[PDB]
C-alpha cells in the first residue's frame, strides 16, 4: 500500500485497474484512497563457475529493490536485480555468463584483492569489442601484402531421431476396459500416429536431400596427395576398415551419448 | 508482475545496439567492403564508389566525371527519407 | 589440382601468377591448417553442441513422456489395473476417464512439441542442402555464406545426425599505407585504370590489385582514356609507358 | 492437485526460457558481425558525400 | 480450475512458440547484414 494521488469520483470508492485489479481503495475511516500493488515474487537464479574451478556461487533475483529482499558484500543492484557475493568493477571484458541489461559475470582472478587472487566472481559492463582506430585520408589507400588461409568448422544439424508410438499402449496399456472409453474419444490417436509417421518419412527425405546431391559414386583416389597438397585426413583411408575419414572417426567419438 | 508474469530486459540494451550500428556505418564509410573480409583497410570514399560502379557495370570514369551530381542526389535522397520517416508512416507498422 | 586452385584465385581477384609462384608455401599452410583442425577437434573441445544439443532434448522429451505415465492425473492409482481392481465399474470408469484424459493430454503435448522441432530441423536442413550446393560444388562470390572472408572452397564431413563443413578461405594481412589518386593526367588527357588501383610507393606511381601488392608499369592496355583531365577531382600528373613506342 | 499433475510446470518454463535465450541469440547474430568497434569519424562529410 | 488454466497456459505457450517466424526473419536479417551491408551484392532484388 502507498498513498494515492490520482483522484477518485467523490461517490466512487473502489478503483479497479485495466485488468480490474484494485489500483486503490478509499479508506473508510478517512475517505482517502491508497494505491495498491502486489509486491515482489522473485525467481531464484544461480551463477556458478565450473565446479572444477571453484565452489563459490552467486545468486540473482529479478524482483528486487535490494532492501526488499531478506538477508552480501556490496550487493550490486542492476535492472536485472541485485546479486550476492560479487563486486562491481569498472573494468570491461568480453561478456561472460550474462546477467543481462548490460551486466556480465565472470569467475575471474579478483586482481583487486592484491596477490591473494581470490578469483572472486565479478560482474561488469561488457566491452562491445576491442577499440579500433582509423583515419579517413582522401588520398591514402591501405593494401594488404600477405595472404593467409585459415579453415574453420561449421556445424549444421540435418536429421531427427525417428521415433514412433502406439496410442493404445501408452494411454491404456493392456486393459480390455479401455479402447471402449477410448473409442468414445474418436479418431484422436489415429492422426496422432499419422502425424509422427509423416514426420519420420519427412526427415528421411531430408537426409537424402542433404547428402545425395551426388551424381554418381566416384571412385576414391589411390594416392592421397595432389600436387603437394595433403588430403590424407578427409579422404577414407583404404587401409582402415572404417572406410571413413580419420576426422569422422574422431567425430563419431567426440559427440557424447 | 501480474499473478506470475515477468518480462526480462534484453541482454543488449538499445545503447550498445546503437553503438554497433555506429561502428558499422563508420566502417562502411572508411574501410569499405573489405573489413567484412578479415581485417579493415582504409579507402577514400570516391575510390570505393567508383569500385562499386565497376562492380555494377559502368566504368569508374562515369562516377568521377559526375561526382558532384551523384553526391547531391544522394544527399537529397537521405533528406527525403528523413522527411518521410519524419512524417507519421506505416513503414514501422 | 593446381589448375583448379589457380582458377579459384581468379575467382577472388588475385591473379594466377600468385598461386603458380607460391604453391609451395600455400600448400604448406594448407597442410598445417588441416592439422590444426585435426587437433582442435581431437581435444575434448565440444564445438559440436549444435549436433549434440538436438539429441539431448529428444531423450529429455521421451523421458518426460515416460515419467508422465507414472504420474496419475486426478487418479488415485497411477497404474490402471489397481483402478480396475479397487472400485465398482461405474466409479472406476470415472477414474479411468480422468486418467485417459490426462494421458491423452500428455500425448498431445508430446506431439505438438515434436512437430515444432520438426519444423526447426526442416529449416536447418534446408539450409544444409543450400550450403552443400553453393559452397562445396562451386566457388561462391557471396560473402560470409560459406566462410569468413573470400571463399576458396569447401569440404563436407558426415557426423551423427548432421553435417560438419570445413571451409578453405582466403584472408589478407600485413597492411601497408600507400599514396593514391583516382586517376592520372598523362598529356592533358585523363586515363582510368582498369581492374586495378593506382598507388605511389614514394618514387613513382604504379598499378596494383586489391589483395596482393604488386606494382606494374602503367600501360595503355592497363588503362583507358575517358574525358578531359580537368573534370577529374584529385587527378595527378604522370606518364603512361607505351610498350610499342 | 498440481503436485498430482506431472511436471507440466517444468515443460512450460523450459520452453519459454529457451524462447528468451533464443531471442538474445538472434539479436547478437544480427548485430554482432564486427570484430572491432570503430570510432566515429569526426568529420561527417566525405568527398562531397 | 486446474484443468482449464493449465490447458490455457499450454495454448499460450504453443502460440508463443509459433517464435519460429521471428527466428527465420532474424536469420534473413543476419544474411542481409553479412551480404549487403558488408559488401556488394550481384544477386538482384535481395537488397533494394
Ligand atoms: C607472409 O609472411 C610469412 C611470415 O614470415 C612468410 O613466411 C616466410 O617468409 C619468408 C620470407 O618471405 C621465407 O623465407 C620463409 O620460408 C616463410 N616461411 C613460411 C612458413 O611461410 C610468407 O612468405 C609471407 N608471404 C609471402 C607471399 O611472402
Ligand atoms: C599427408 O598427411 C598425413 C597426416 O598428416 C601424413 O600421415 C602422417 O605421416 C607422419 C609421418 O610418417 C606419421 O607420423 C603420421 O602418423 C601420419 N598420420 C596419418 C594419419 O597417416 C602423410 O604422410 C601425408 N602425406 C603426404 C604425401 O604429404
Ligand atoms: C619504388 O618504385 C621504384 C621504381 O620501380 C623502385 O625502384 C626499382 O626497384 C627495382 C627493384 O630491384 C629495381 O630493379 C629498379 O632498378 C629500380 N628502379 C630505379 C629507377 O631505381 C623501388 O624499388 C620501389 N620501392 C619500393 C619501396 O616499393
Ligand atoms: C600537370 O602539368 C600541366 C602542364 O605543365 C599543368 O598545367 C599547367 O601547368 C603550369 C605549370 O607551369 C601552370 O602554371 C598552369 O596553371 C597549368 N594549367 C594551365 C596552363 O592551364 C598542370 O597544372 C599540372 N597538374 C598537376 C596536378 O601537376
Ligand atoms: C473516523 O471516525 C473517527 C471516530 O469518531 C473520527 O474521529 C474521524 O474524524 C473520522 N474520520 C473521518 C470522518 O474522516
Ligand atoms: C528502492 O528503495 C529506495 C528507498 O526507498 C528508493 O530510493 C528507490 O527508488 C527504490 N528503487 C526502486 C523501487 O526501483
Ligand atoms: C600508416 O598506417 C598506420 C596504421 O597502422 C597509421 O598509424 C599511420 O599514421 C600511417 N602513416 C601514414 C604516413 O599514412
Ligand atoms: C585532401 O585533403 C587535404 C587535407 O585534408 C586537402 O588539402 C586536399 O585538397 C584534399 N584533396 C582532395 C582531392 O580531396
Topology, number of strands of chain A: 17
Structural class of chain A: alpha+beta
- How large a portion of the residues of chain A is in β-strands, by DSSP E? 15-25%
Query: Which oligomerization state do the chains in this entry correspond to?
Result: part of a larger assembly
Helical residue percent band of chain A: 10-25%
Write the H/E string of chain A, N to C: EEEEEEEEEEEEEEEHHHEEH
C-alpha-based Rg of chain A, rounded: 32 Å
Provide a count of the helices of chain A.
Answer: 4
Largest sheet properties of chain A: 4 strands, antiparallel
Protein name (chain B): Spike protein S2'
PDB class: viral protein/hydrolase
Keywords: spike, viral protein/hydrolase, VIRAL PROTEIN-HYDROLASE complex
Entry title: Cryo-EM structure of the WIV1 S-hACE2 complex
What can you tell me about this protein's structure?
The structure is cut from a larger assembly and holds five copies of chain A. Chain A has 257 residues and is of the alpha+beta class. In chain A, 16% of the residues lie in helices and 24% in strands. Chain A has helices at residues 167-171, 181-184, 188-211, 246-254; strands at residues 2-3, 14-16, 22-26, 33-35, 44-47, 58-61, 77-78, 81-82, 87-88, 98-100, 103-107, 121-124, 130-132, 140-149, 152-157, 225-226, 229-230. In chain A, the strands form five sheets. Chain A has a four-stranded antiparallel beta sheet, with no helix packed on it. In chain A, strand 3 and strand 4 form a beta hairpin. The longest helix of chain A is centred in the last third of the chain and has 24 residues, at 188-211. The first copy, chain A, is extended. In chain A, 19% of the residues are buried. Chains in contact: A-B, A-C, A-D, B-C, B-D, B-E, C-D, C-E, D-E. At the A-C interface, strand 14, strand 15, helix 1, helix 3 and strand 17 of A face helix 2, helix 3, helix 4, helix 5 and strand 1 of C. Strand 15 of chain A pairs antiparallel with strand 2 (162-179) of chain C, so a sheet runs across the interface. Bound molecules: a molecule of 2 linked components (NAG-NAG) (4 copies) and 2-acetamido-2-deoxy-beta-D-glucopyranose (NAG) (4 copies). A molecule of 2 linked components (NAG-NAG) binds next to loops of chain A. One 2-acetamido-2-deoxy-beta-D-glucopyranose (NAG) binds at residues 65, 67 of chain A. Chain C: It comes from Bat SARS-like coronavirus WIV1. Chain C: Glycans are attached at residues 177, 201, 237. Chain C: Disulfide bonds join 135-146, 185-229. Chain C: This is Spike protein S2'. Chain C: Residues 23-73 are annotated as: Heptad repeat 1.
Amino acid at each position: 500500500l502507498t498513498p494515492s494521488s490520482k483522484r477518485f469520483q467523490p461517490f466512487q470508492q473502489f478503483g479497479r485497474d485495466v485488468s480490474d485489479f484494485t489500483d486503490s481503495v478509499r479508506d473508510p475511516k478517512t475517505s482517502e484512497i491508497l494505491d495498491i500493488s502486489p509486491c515482489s515474487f522473485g525467481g531464484v537464479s544461480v551463477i556458478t563457475p565450473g565446479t572444477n574451478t571453484s565452489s563459490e556461487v552467486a545468486v540473482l533475483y529479478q524482483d528486487v529493490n535490494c532492501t526488499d529482499v531478506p538477508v552480501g558484500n556490496n550487493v550490486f543492484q542492476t535492472q536485472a536485480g541485485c546479486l550476492i557475493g560479487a563486486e562491481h568493477v569498472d573494468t570491461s571484458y568480453e561478456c561472460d555468463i550474462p546477467i543481462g541489461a548490460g551486466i556480465c559475470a565472470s569467475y575471474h582472478t579478483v586482481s583487486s584483492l592484491r596477490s591473494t587472487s581470490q578469483k572472486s566472481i565479478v560482474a561488469y559492463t561488457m566491452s562491445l569489442g576491442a577499440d579500433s582506430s582509423i583515419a579517413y585520408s582522401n588520398n591514402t589507400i591501405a593494401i594488404p601484402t600477405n595472404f593467409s588461409i585459415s579453415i574453420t568448422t561449421e556445424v549444421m544439424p540435418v536429421s531427427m531421431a525417428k521415433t514412433s508410438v502406439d496410442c493404445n499402449m501408452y494411454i491404456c496399456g493392456d486393459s480390455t476396459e479401455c479402447a471402449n472409453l477410448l473409442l468414445q474419444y474418436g479418431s484422436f490417436c489415429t492422426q496422432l500416429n499419422r502425424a509422427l509417421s509423416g514426420i519420420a518419412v519427412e526427415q528421411d527425405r531430408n537426409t537424402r536431400e542433404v547428402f545425395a546431391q551426388v551424381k554418381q559414386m566416384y571412385k576414391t583416389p589411390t594416392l592421397k596427395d595432389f600436387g603437394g597438397f595433403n588430403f590424407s585426413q578427409i579422404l577414407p583411408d583404404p587401409l582402415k576398415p572404417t572406410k571413413r575419414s580419420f576426422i569422422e572417426d574422431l567425430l563419431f567419438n567426440k559427440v557424447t551419448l | 508482475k501480474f499473478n506470475g508474469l515477468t518480462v526480462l530486459p534484453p541482454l543488449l540494451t538499445d545503447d550498445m545496439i546503437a553503438a554497433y550500428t555506429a561502428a558499422l556505418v563508420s566502417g562502411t564509410a572508411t574501410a569499405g567492403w573489405t573489413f567484412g573480409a578479415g581485417a579493415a583497410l582504409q579507402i577514400p570514399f570516391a575510390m570505393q564508389m567508383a569500385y562499386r560502379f565497376n562492380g555494377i557495370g559502368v566504368t569508374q570514369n562515369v562516377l568521377y566525371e559526375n561526382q558532384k551530381q551523384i553526391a547531391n542526389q544522394f544527399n537529397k535522397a537521405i533528406s527525403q527519407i528523413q522527411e518521410s520517416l519524419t512524417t507519421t508512416s506505416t513503414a514501422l507498422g | 589440382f593446381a589448375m583448379q586452385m589457380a582458377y579459384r584465385f581468379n575467382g577472388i581477384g588475385v591473379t594466377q601468377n600468385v598461386l603458380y609462384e607460391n604453391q609451395k608455401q600455400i600448400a604448406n599452410q594448407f597442410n598445417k591448417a588441416i592439422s590444426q583442425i585435426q587437433e582442435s577437434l581431437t581435444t575434448t573441445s565440444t564445438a559440436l553442441g549444435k549436433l549434440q544439443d538436438v539429441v539431448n532434448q529428444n531423450a529429455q522429451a521421451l523421458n518426460t513422456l515416460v515419467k508422465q505415465l507414472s504420474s496419475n492425473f486426478g487418479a488415485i492409482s497411477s497404474v490402471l489395473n489397481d483402478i480396475l481392481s479397487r472400485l465398482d465399474p461405474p466409479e472406476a470408469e470415472v477414474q479411468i476417464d480422468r486418467l485417459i484424459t490426462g494421458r491423452l493430454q500428455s500425448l498431445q503435448t508430446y506431439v505438438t512439441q515434436q512437430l515444432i522441432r520438426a519444423a526447426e530441423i526442416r529449416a536447418s536442413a534446408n539450409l544444409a542442402a543450400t550450403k552443400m550446393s553453393e559452397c562445396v560444388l562451386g566457388q561462391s562470390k557471396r560473402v560470409d555464406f560459406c566462410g569468413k572472408g573470400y571463399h576458396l572452397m569447401s569440404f563436407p564431413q558426415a557426423a551423427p545426425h548432421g553435417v560438419v563443413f570445413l571451409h578453405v578461405t582466403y584472408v589478407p594481412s600485413q597492411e601497408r599505407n600507400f599514396t593514391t589518386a583516382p586517376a592520372i593526367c598523362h598529356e592533358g588527357k585523363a586515363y582510368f585504370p582498369r581492374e586495378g588501383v593506382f598507388v605511389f610507393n614514394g618514387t613513382s606511381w604504379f598499378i596494383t590489385q586489391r589483395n596482393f601488392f604488386s606494382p606494374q608499369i602503367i600501360t595503355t592496355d592497363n588503362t583507358f582514356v575517358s574525358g578531359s583531365c580537368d573534370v577529374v577531382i584529385g587527378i595527378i600528373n604522370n606518364t603512361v609507358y607505351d610498350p610499342l613506342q
